[PDB]
Amino acid sequence: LVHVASVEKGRSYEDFQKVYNAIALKLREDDEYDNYIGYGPVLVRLAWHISGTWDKHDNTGGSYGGTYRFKKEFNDPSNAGLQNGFKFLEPIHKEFPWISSGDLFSLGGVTAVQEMQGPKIPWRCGRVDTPEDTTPDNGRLPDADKDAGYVRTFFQRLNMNDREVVALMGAHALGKTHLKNSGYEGPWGAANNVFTNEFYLNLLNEDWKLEKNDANNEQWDSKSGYMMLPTDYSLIQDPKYLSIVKEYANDQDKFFKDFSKAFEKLLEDGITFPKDAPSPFIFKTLEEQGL
Template identity: 70%
Template sequence: MSTLPLFSKIISRRSLYLFSAATLAGAATVAATAATVDNRKQYNYGNRNQNNNNKSGWSLFGASSVAAAAPIVHIAALNKDRKIDDYQRIYNKIAEKIREEDEYDGYIGYGPILVRLGWHSSGTYDKTNNSGGSYGGTYRFKLESSDPSNNGLQNAAKFLDPIYKEFNWISHGDLYTLGAVCAVQEAQGPKIPWRPGRVDLPETETPANGRLPDANNGADYVRNFYARLRMNDREAVALTGAHCLGRTHYKNSGFDGPWGAASNSFTNEFFVNLLNEQWKLEKNKSGNYQYDSPKGYMMLKTDYALIQDPSYLKIVKEFANDEASFFKEFASSFQKLLENGIDYPKGAPQYIFKTLDEQDI
């Protein structure tokens, strides 16, 4: 049994919703309500943000067409009982399961889809009101998991289910993001600093569908989409480089094919192929347009846009010629994506995990 004071126990399992003084000016009171969700207490200070933007409320480039509410503040809830060794054990369980179940998706394995789950659960973030993102672990609810852009990710969630049952003290947001970090590193990718503190929020805090990227667009869309995630051009190109992993499937996305030959290894191949393959825009059997190469590789229109835009093209060339540069930028950008919208207290621990291979040495 924990020896932490009662107040510390509550803090470690709570979410704070703090609205700006400007919005609350003239209000007689600030309501404080407590609700128990998934056996974790959630404390809501002030009225819950009602600006749940869906696709009809967004422009083509993801900018809100309605007035944004005051920003929500999501405070990282740190469990002082847990240290890096506790999270390393979870990392190891995920990594071992990736190795053991390597036949998934034609022996590509679960690594790529775990990266996608962490990416997509974070990619709902909106800087205009600090909503969405990885903090609340809301992918576990049907509203988010049924977003068409998340087709296929249920397999990643099912993969993590037994991990959660064994370590049910971890929040879903922490588990989804830790799984993504593990998958990148075990695929020989860069080390990604990771911090815990996400809190399981109730279903009412699930962002509406329509916040994830639409592949049928060009460079302007890409730039504006990533701007909503607080990402600049370098960060946008680096994060798109995660397409070095995995492949597309008609049944999930309406596209088909791998981005390269090494679908379960984290490399700069995506950028090399983008520059060097003979791409042809073709209409696939699902009625969507994708770029295909004679080698059987594919690129989405949002991928190909990176060599159509002068600013993006310069960065693509850099990453194609210098894998270390790509790794460095991806590590910092991916950490930023996973942490968007979370307010970490000063001195909050940051962990860098050892891979299974490193632990075997």
């Protein structure tokens, strides 16, 4: 399986920048979502989810094909709740019908992070919609009630190392868990719609208590009213993970750099970019454009 990136016929950066701006303006506008958290978080998760089905062994899954659009994938239990992100993007697609789905879903994640003050994430266009037949089976996304070994092992299927895994998890600073969706309830911190290294700080600074939730699943709860999943918690249980956690807890700048590289890598896994492909684009935020 080779997936070669193919730029949408006749589109350029400017064309992409417009899609980014539309998503961004909509984020600004639909602020009531999830008790005022906004759609930022859910969009980041959607980009991560359409990309985490990848399997470096046979190259199936990943963001290329926009398969989330198909029922099999759309209805995946690990995908519960993502439908709101989809519905959010729907009108955007309508406005820019020449964009491929994989490109739109991935770009929403990038837009979200950057509009939430995170770092700039270089992005590449070229993903091609593939047939229903290419939809990966459910079951490729990770479980939350496990430990560091599980996590390490899991991430390897996506080619990510320790550092990448820790960086990537800092996305947990965003949004929250919802009982109805995953069987977990509560946010990971306080500034849940602003991109910061809060996640590491919390994991190292709170006094966490293991308890069972209303869905009968365990979670680490803090006095502050925050929570951590077993997998999140495992980052302080593993020696190697822990020191990276501390490093991020100490230098937000490091964290942003590392996050940036990993997220792009994550969204580009499984895709082959020809020599003549344009370089990655770095989009301007609304603010940088005075919009």
